[PDB]
Amino acid sequence: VTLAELASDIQSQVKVIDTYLTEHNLPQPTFAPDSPRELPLDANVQRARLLLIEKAMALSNLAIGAADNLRWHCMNNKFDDMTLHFLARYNIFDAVPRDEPISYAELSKKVGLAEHRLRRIMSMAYTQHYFCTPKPGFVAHTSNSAMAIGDPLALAWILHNIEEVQPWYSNKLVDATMKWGDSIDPKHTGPNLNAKPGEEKLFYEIMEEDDQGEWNGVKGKGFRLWRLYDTDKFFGTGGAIKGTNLLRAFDWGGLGKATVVDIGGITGHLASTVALANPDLTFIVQERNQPWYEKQFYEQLPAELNGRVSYMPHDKYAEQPVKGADVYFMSTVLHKEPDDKAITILRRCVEAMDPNKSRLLTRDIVMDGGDPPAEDRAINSKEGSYEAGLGPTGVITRLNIGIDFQVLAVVNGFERTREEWVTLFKKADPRFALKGCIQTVGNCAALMEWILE
């Protein structure tokens, strides 16, 4: 592929998006804070967006060239993360007004970072389109930075990765691999490289036990786990894996008056998203209890739900106490479970299921891709062997791998192909059949519907 071919590909994809926008009289994405945060969910628009991203990234890579790529990457990449670190820890997103500029001097005063160093940090942020400088000596927001204003969930994501995942786990993965090999034991992770036998610590033990700190309403014990729950919420409130995409991936309204048991449902935020849009559904959120859990669960719970979403403490490996529910639902649970543990959970579900009335729904990455929702005969040419966003340089592929590495790093988890999912479920119970595997375009996760035939 050449620079000219990439450019031409880019032109075609932009034309599809630009046409849609203008046809529907929709505002154009820009770097201004008032810009739309995403493009339309129309499947053709999203396919063009995903291809556009991939091509643009290839074009920048090709123009940098082989001599400079490795050289520049190991120089700069780490500093984009560091810049974020500063931005979060000094609360700079909130300190810059959303719609007015602020001088470096007054920004400095507000956040307590000396003006010289502040200037340096901001300068790196600008090159990734986080903030901009509209006039000498002044800072203003961009669309990318403005979305973090007033959002602790965004800061949670920044900090969890930079202060936990990367120094404790991903920086150490090579060493962990050389020590324990290709293991699926969650104890064979970075923090235990020099631990004595029996003194190993699990990621989720560290999260729920550490008491030296505070986060967003939770002080002391488990503040890191609470921040982790905020990260989970961050991926449900916007973007690629947002909760409202669940509504297009399964006919929740067709269940009528029904109960959904949400196994490993975190703080029930995803359950609430489905229940708010589907007034006839009742949700039982099953999760491991914590000293602050019930307090935060009911503070978050929308009163509009009128109690249709409730919390039931539960061990996902134990007998399932709700029998014959319409739906047993697990969102991004099983990709942290090796086959034997996944089978245990699945068999607990099977025992409680009525085979002629219960479904088991899972939301997880399907590494080779799910099917588009029904609502969505190709007209303009498809590329290569893969759907848009997938393939070895696809941007959804990239997201899939990033999540694969995220669970590999903290618990030695892994993502699975569709074939691997069907094989695992059939090992849990031979009656299991995959009825639907729906991946909305732009999403990395599929909603899989399983029944026992």
Report 215-254 residues binding a second copy (CB under 8 A): 234-235, 238-240, 242
Least Cβ distance, residue 75 to a second copy (angstroms):
4
Closest CA to 414 of 431, 427, 400: 400
Contact in structure between 330 and 264 (CB atoms under 8 Å): yes
Least Cβ distance, residue 7 to Na ion (angstroms):
48
CA dist., res. 16 & res. 13, Å (int): 5
Which of 145, 286, 400, 439 touches Na ion (CB under 5 A)? Answer: 286
Chosen from Na ion, a second copy, none, partner binding at 17 (C-beta under 5 to 8 Å by type): a second copy
Residues contacting a second copy: total by CB under 8 A: 110
- Return the number of the residue (119 or 341) whose C-beta is nearest a second copy: 119
- Return the number of the residue (264 or 373) whose C-beta is nearest Na ion: 264
Segment 308-327, which members bind Na ion (CB under 5 A)?
314, 316
CA dist., res. 283 & res. 39, Å (int): 31
CA dist., res. 186 & res. 130, Å (int): 36
Chosen from a second copy, Na ion, none, partner binding at 286 (C-beta under 5 to 8 Å by type): Na ion
Report DSSP letters for 257-273, one per residue: SEEEEEET-TTSHHHHH
Segment 181-220, which members bind a second copy (CB under 8 A)?
181-182
Report DSSP letters for 169-209, one per residue: IGGGHHHHHHHH-S---TTSSGGGTTPPTT----HHHHHHH
SS3 annotation, 391-445: CCCCHHHHHHHHHHHHHHHHHCCCCECHHHHHHHHHHHCCCEEEEEEECCCCCCE
Segment 156-175, which members bind a second copy (CB under 8 A)?
157-158, 161-162, 165-167, 170-171, 173-174
Least Cβ distance, residue 448 to a second copy (angstroms):
22
Closest CA to 444 of 245, 275, 230, 262: 245
Segment 393-452, which members bind a second copy (CB under 8 A)?
393-395, 397-399, 401-406, 408, 414
Question: Which residues sit opposite 81 in a β-bridge?
Answer: none
Least Cβ distance, residue 161 to a second copy (angstroms):
4
- Return the number of the residue (236 or 264) whose C-beta is nearest a second copy: 236
Sign of CA dihedral 266, 304, 300, 143: positive
Chosen from Na ion, a second copy, none, partner binding at 123 (C-beta under 5 to 8 Å by type): a second copy
Segment 7-36, which members bind a second copy (CB under 8 A)?
7, 10-11, 14, 17-18, 28-31, 35-36
Least Cβ distance, residue 432 to a second copy (angstroms):
24
